[PDB]
Amino acid sequence: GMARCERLRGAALRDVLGQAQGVLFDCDGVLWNGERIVPGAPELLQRLARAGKNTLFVSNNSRRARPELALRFARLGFAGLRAEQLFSSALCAARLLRQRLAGVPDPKAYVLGSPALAAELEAVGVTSVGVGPDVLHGDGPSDWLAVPLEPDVRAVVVGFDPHFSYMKLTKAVRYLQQPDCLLVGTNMDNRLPLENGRFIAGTGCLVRAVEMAAQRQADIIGKPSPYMFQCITEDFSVDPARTLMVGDRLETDILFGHRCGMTTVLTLTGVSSLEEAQAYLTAGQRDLVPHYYVESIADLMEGL
Amino acid sequence: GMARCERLRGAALRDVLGQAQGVLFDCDGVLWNGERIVPGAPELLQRLARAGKNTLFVSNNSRRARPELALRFARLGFAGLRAEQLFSSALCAARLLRQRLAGVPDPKAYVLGSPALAAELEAVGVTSVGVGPDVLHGDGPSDWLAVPLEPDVRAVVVGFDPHFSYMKLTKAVRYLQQPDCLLVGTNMDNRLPLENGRFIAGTGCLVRAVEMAAQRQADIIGKPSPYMFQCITEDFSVDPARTLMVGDRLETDILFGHRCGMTTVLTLTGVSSLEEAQAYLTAGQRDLVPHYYVESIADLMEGL
Ligand SMILES: [Mg+2]
Ligand SMILES: [Mg+2]
């Protein structure tokens, strides 16, 4: 219940991991950093599998699709992995629209995002527009507002989009003038972590901008939004009480666990540090303190 | 004292307006709506001048320089207007940087904004770069982050920029990696009002985007930011107790007045309606309740 931020070892470690029906893994900062993977991570999955434990993988990535993600696992030495275990914000975004755009014929979405995100939409029957560069044509507003749009658009989907422009912001706002139109954000992250400790602006910057202009609260898919779990529980029977959430980041992965009622395990490889976790415990922010923590997910094995 | 949202007529209209040493006007929705001016607005100004009252004009516009704004006034039938009375967010942005870069040699700023905003900076001694289109080329992040920047940049200034892109956002974040660098936002408005009641995304959307990515709280110039007043009091001696703030919007102009200690007057020829004012008074949110209100600023003449 109350995260004591205890290091998960020996007696407690065998208990909690042992009792777990399944384990939920963030990918970046947990299983790997770039193409260089965390020691013993592949073996951990093998043993989790043989222990009879369901392992699922969750990612706020919105740039590259399920197929190319499964391959990434293979490239990095993770084998025997089914695509059905992979859940990205783009996938779950598509899943949301399909449910919302139920009895709507020829469902269309304006997409400020990647070709992958489009693919995930196209896999659920939702056609896409907006992917790619949209440079600003015209002298002033009257020109920008006269650009012909898609009449069948029933949703604005903001994912990660390096081609995000004021022009796209305008189109999205225009589309959203129809109240019935949906606004979806793949994730609210302010930063996208990069391989060697670098970063660039995160999708949440683009989402928040559209929200402000359109004066709307977007539906967010990715962690720490509980819908990520919703997306999972539709496919898998996941008793959160018997499932561990493992992540490197406190503001995404851990908060996700608490909101879903999962026992959370912070790994000290990746973004967050223990000092920060205790600082939250230390600061009274009851929802960002991990129940347990480990130096690396490799430490989890003796629990099996 | 406590703004009761009273209708300003006869005795009350005679009292405070009579006692007022000066009057501060927002332009859009007060003096005019688009190119259509409020009947008798020019007359009010003529009569205020002869009454011996200093009139100043404040705007969150960042697309028009002081000169080009003065012309708008003259061409729209407002005569005897000195440019010294005009205060735009772009102008005050320049005033801020000049003060903050008080002793920096060859000061440079990265500007996500208009050529005008650049001019106000260039008139104040601050060199500018970033104005105009900045298309994103390169396959991924490593390419985007390897783009050579201008070394002398000591400030990021976010104004209204229809060329705003993820590349510009990226450049801004990189500049801001040096903590000593400044982050300035001309205004935080969610929307930019257009001639015929239309609108487009406001500067505040872009600013918030840069803030999130760079994890910075930008310094805001325009209303309702008190700095707009500071910018003015550097030029004019304004006793706020003897100065009227007149505006069409409650959340920008009126909030601005309360924060500066000016007697606030809502004109109903603009964005806000009387209904909204009564809602705030009813709700106890004192900083958005106008002390007084008039159907049009033309009603103020009988106070003289
Ligand atoms: Mg991660
Ligand atoms: Mg206005």
Swiss-Prot record, chains A, B:
Pfam families in the record: Hydrolase_6, Hydrolase_like
Active site: 26 (nucleophile), 28 (proton donor)
Cofactor names: Mg(2+)
Residues reported in the UniProt entry to bind Mg(2+): 26, 28, 248
GO CC annotations, alphabetized: actin cytoskeleton; cell-cell junction; cleavage furrow; contractile ring; cytosol; glutamatergic synapse; lamellipodium membrane; midbody
EC numbers: 3.1.3.16, 3.1.3.74
Key words of the record: Cell membrane, Cell projection, Cytoplasm, Cytoskeleton, Hydrolase, Magnesium, Membrane, Metal-binding, Pyridoxal phosphate
Binding-site residues, substrate: 59-61, 223
Cofactor note: Divalent metal ions. Mg(2+) is the most effective.
Gene3D superfamilies per UniProt: HAD superfamily/HAD-like
Regulation: Inhibited by beryllium trifluoride.
Domain of life according to the entry: Eukaryota
Enzyme class: hydrolase
Membrane topology note: Peripheral membrane protein
Role according to the record: Functions as a pyridoxal phosphate (PLP) phosphatase, which also catalyzes the dephosphorylation of pyridoxine 5'-phosphate (PNP) and pyridoxamine 5'-phosphate (PMP), with order of substrate preference PLP > PNP > PMP and therefore plays a role in vitamin B6 metabolism. Also functions as a protein serine phosphatase that specifically dephosphorylates 'Ser-3' in proteins of the actin-depolymerizing factor (ADF)/cofilin family like CFL1 and DSTN. Thereby, regulates cofilin-dependent actin cytoskeleton reorganization, being required for normal progress through mitosis and normal cytokinesis.
Assembly and interaction partners: Homodimer.
Identification of the protein by name: Chronophin
Organism: Mus musculus
